[model samples]
Target chain A: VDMMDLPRSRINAGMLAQFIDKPVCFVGRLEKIHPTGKMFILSDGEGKNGTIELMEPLDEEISGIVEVVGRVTAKATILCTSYVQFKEDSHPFDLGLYNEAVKIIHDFPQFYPLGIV
Target chain B: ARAQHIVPCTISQLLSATLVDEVFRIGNVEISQVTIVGIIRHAEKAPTNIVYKIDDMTAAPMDVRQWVDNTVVPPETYVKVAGHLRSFQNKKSLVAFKIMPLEDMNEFTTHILEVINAHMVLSKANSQP
Candidate 1:
């Protein structure tokens, strides 16, 4: 398939609502593994505050950095289209910094409101 | 047709919503009129155009389509792409105007740093009065 045909977004759990019906790319740790192997929970290092569902089995072990590309269903679940597991020694970018950045953005709006009030 | 001058842009330099670390939210509402640099992950040729899957070491990979006849870059080749971000059925893609191959690896680092620097400047600007 032409992977280039789909529009892509990099997102976290807190931003899921805004991406419903859109394609997204998410990088996080595989926090939990279901024996069934078809479902799993991904977390952005802060437990449930940044958790999202993955409806695909991963070939890699848990606790590793994984990248997921898929569509966000109306229910906020990800129907994974493709994914990659980063090896311990080879990460395209700094995962820690990325997670920290997400946390700040997700929470910053609350402290410094966007004039939504 | 009158020729237009195209300036280069980058993904990190674009002001997009933060989806997570490294991953920025992209859509028609977020960014436009930007160029991006990255390695091609996938490429396909069509009768009228060519499509490329590009990853600029950002959060997620993006698809860029050259609507006219163009040279196709193989996977893992560094490329510079100029395009505007677009959306279709809620999917985000780029309609590319130009694509060039980078002969020097230094160009890659330079582009990456440019993205980081741009992000820093924009972040500071947004945080202040």
Candidate 2:
């Protein structure tokens, strides 16, 4: 299928493997930390969800309404490099900061509300 | 015209919701509400629904839909994810297996979360507005 005819929702890891070299966005909440390193549940609004692993070290206290931009590195984890908060308001219009040829990150559950507001 | 099914080179690629929908439409695949993510990509909408691009990395962009609300994700945050395999509208691809948000406090249960699938309902209601 050409890119235009694809579904708006419902994406999986196997489909993303082809573009492992490419960058993608994961919009969800940080459910919890897995036993292995920094693992968390990245959930879509639907029942479908995935796991996100913070390969790098982030401020342990980094809390409240957050958004991330990075590429998919594994089947069950993403190596996040840049992190931000959606509550900032100004971030959405900052196209230069989150520049995807076609971006789709919005207000997800775990990522909303910045800094315990 | 009907949408076509597409397959990807690997099952680890990730695509945005728009790219996935574009692929399915170009491929002429047949999809249903349950099959596709049912996303509305228009910018006019505010507080948009939680839509995803359903695919394994190997498959082409196939489906896009708003499965649920963004509340389960913690209001406003970014997430990192692992890829997984799924199919829709006869097409398939790899999508994020894990989604990592940057919230310190957790309010809802990710696993038990249920999406109202209110796209059709809300759209129809809002049409009059």
Candidate 3:
């Protein structure tokens, strides 16, 4: 599917397995970068983590929390398509509060349907 | 002593907010001020107010009115707005009080989660003792 038609489901590291090979939007803190510069570990907002593989070099300076819109690979790593960065904004980022929201969204998919583009 | 509170809500939920006596209620919780986040789709100056179309990727874009502003915020900027939901002449609208652009993109996600959290807490509170 083309980028316009592709649906980016909201996901955290915990559900990477469920969305394998599907386009998903995962938000997490950048944990550690791979030495090869193609992959990195992301600390999920919900007390979890996963490896993410970039389709292209992340030339931009990456740090703090970021949203990665990409498809999940067979290896369960995110084949990164694009991302939005969260720098030191006006307010401090709260990871735990975000995690709670992710939980509710999953629990009440009928209401939120975060999967919908 | 006060359950009447300011709450975080998604555009979809805001659109569906139930009102009793012209007061909006979310699952038994009384709410007047609603905090919503979305990208600014279009902004225009009108004689009445600064009309802004706020889209959180929900359904139709929400038109929020800002009574005052001099420095303009360009379109496509993510912003958080807290205001009282108003209905006039058989139509719904919002009078935004706090309208600040999000410096960090993660704030958008934060607002999304907060919306879910609001229903989770309020609904669960309504369902149980």
Candidate 4:
């Protein structure tokens, strides 16, 4: 399928369940970088997140905020299509904005799928 | 109630707060004029136009229909969309007039701050005696 034609949704790590079998885009902290660099984990700071399996190893070191665009498998892992990393030194995380965004997702359950709120 | 005003809002805010079929107003403007920043989730092509789903850190993604052009941005790109809000059969969507890609990642932070500032200004204005 054309990458541009896939349906996209933006969600946090915690809400992975809401988008199983769907294409999604999300931003999270690069929590761990596997030795192969083809796989990594992203965290939304809630201790719950998703694993991203890249088609190929990333050339750059994985750190800081990274945006992942991929499809969520039934197993809840992301098959990453593309990703962009933002330098922590230049684009620092804002806890206030992060918390507020998460809160909005949690506060409104109706918008998300049945299980996730 | 005071006259309604349209203000910049996130897709999450639109989904959580606005009622179906109601005219959503922000800081003295219609919801159509409010600014929305999100990542293009998907783009569907049609004979006459294209439609895209956009999510702006908001878990709830909204559809944005572009009727005039077929050029679609690839998924995962950050975009700032300006358009009118609409609903059909309880599903909320956007009729986009403008869609632009964000070259700088910091623009996401800037857009979020813009929404917050706009909300604050509206809040203060609404609370006046």
Candidate 5:
């Protein structure tokens, strides 16, 4: 299926916030493109330097869809999460290939000791 | 007599204190608690390759991968990841848990920081003594 044509939406900060332990999709323009196998910088309204890897070698001339699979991490200074996956851009999948993962805190809040406060 | 009420602040504070103790470390490597801040879509790719990008509070981009067919995880969604810390091509990158997110992101960072910090502290302390 054409991902570009897929019913895409930009998850709201609130929605993204609540999905801390759940997987969700975040679609945005490839403001900056980097070489394949190379970690390029990314920026959205919330933050920047969000690292992105091209599923396939990016032309650097074109900005297409970028997907990530990982929990939305919250930090004091830099606030970008980490998603690691294989397969460069360009290949097709039935359902666009990204979603959030279960959070460690959600399952075992006690492990945190700080509680989910 | 005025009615008295109490809040269990100590429990929460205790947990936080323990967590801080568990997390603090010093060394060539450093690890701290982090939360996902934003998400980026998986880029288009050829049939033979794989790629994906994720953001964290650090806002330091982490690039991840797995080979075609041998893909460790699907690109397009969020995942909690933990692995060895390294700088790849001038970027902060991870080598372990290339495809899987750990139960505690803090665990990875804490462990790394402790080991590194302990060595540094000990080295410094020995020199001073």
Candidate 6:
């Protein structure tokens, strides 16, 4: 049985509460890494924050933007399954534009069901 | 030369496309060029083509194939690719004309927003026509 086929919903920090216990995919910039290397803070698309707890500790230093696929186990904590960081491009990510996309997507359910999903 | 609209979409959206006659359609619109941002998990080199599998965290994985002149990519790295969508028999594939390892982090953030934004335009077009 493959669990990955369950489908992961694209989520932002603001959407965490609604997807508790459900698998989700979050993309944001790294805020802080704990000294223990077991957990870290990821900036929410909305300029907020959420914590990511790793099952397997990270060995290398990670920064910039990252995509974390995991399940929301708490109020806003994502127990990550896969974490992949992105390198810088022409400039830093446009957080203002990206944040608008998050709000736009969440506010308009019509944008997803037959479209973005 | 004909003008083509490059559609921003995810693997799941492409997989969920409906066949209108012989063409696959999303939101009642047939897309020619597909713009995708995902991680390359696996790559296969054939005598005539190179195939790469990608994941965008949307669950179902999709494959993109480049002609023999393509280069191979290392796994677990991010990439952005734009190409035409093809359906042979029953499988869906992207025939890549442009594939490259991503250089900017903003591209990833921008891509998802573009996809959401594209659908809005597509919907408005359908609503009027």
By DockQ, who's the top model here? 6
Please report the candidate that would top TM-score against the real structure: 6
Q: Tens digits of per-residue lDDT for model 5 on A31-91?
A: 5644453444433334333444433553344344344433334421112233333233443
Index of the highest-lDDT prediction? 6
Name the candidate, 2 or 6, with the larger TM-score value. 6
Cα lDDT tens digits, model 6, B19-111, are 888777876667768889888878998989889888776656678998884358898888899998888887888999988888776677678
Query: What are the clash counts of all predictions, listed in order?
Result: 3, 124, 0, 13, 58, 3
Off by over 4 Å in 2: A1-18, A35-37, A62-65, A88-117, B1-129
Interface RMSD of each: 9.5, 15.9, 5.0, 7.0, 14.2, 3.4
Compute the lDDT of residue A47 as modeled in candidate 3.
Answer: 62
Candidate 5 TM-score, C-alpha based = 0.26
Per-residue error for A81 in candidate 6, Å, reads 0.9
lDDT of candidate 6? 0.77
DockQ of 1: 0.04
TM-score of 4: 0.58
Error of 6 at B75 (Å): 2.0
Off by over 4 Å in 1: A1-4, A49-63, A90-94, A103-117, B1-40, B43-53, B56-116, B119-129
Predicted candidate 3 versus true structure: per-residue lDDT over B34-112, tens digit per residue: 8888767689887667988886644456889998635667886778999998767656677998899888655776677
Task: Write model 4 residue lDDT over A9-95, tens digit each, in one string.
Answer: 656776788879887766788789889989999876454567999889988886877877788889888888877765455556653
Candidate 1 lDDT at B89 equals 65
lDDT of 5 by residue, B1-129 (tens): 632211111112111222224432222112332222212345335586554554331222344433464444434443544333333454443333344543333333343233233434444654542
Clashing pairs in 6: A88-B104, A89-B103, A89-B104
What TM-score would you give candidate 2 relative to the actual structure? Answer: 0.29
**Comparing 3 and 6 by lDDT, which wins?**
6
Q: Please state the CAPRI-style docking class of candidate 3.
A: incorrect
Note the Cα lDDT for every prediction shown: 0.58, 0.33, 0.72, 0.67, 0.33, 0.77
What's the TM-score of every candidate structure?
0.47, 0.29, 0.61, 0.58, 0.26, 0.85
A1-117 per-residue lDDT for model 1 (tens digits): 223344465567777889887767677777777776766677754444233455556566656666676777888877776665544543244555565545543454322121111
> lDDT tens string, model 4, B13-102?
565445425666433323545568877778998877789888654444678988763367888777888777776787878888888877
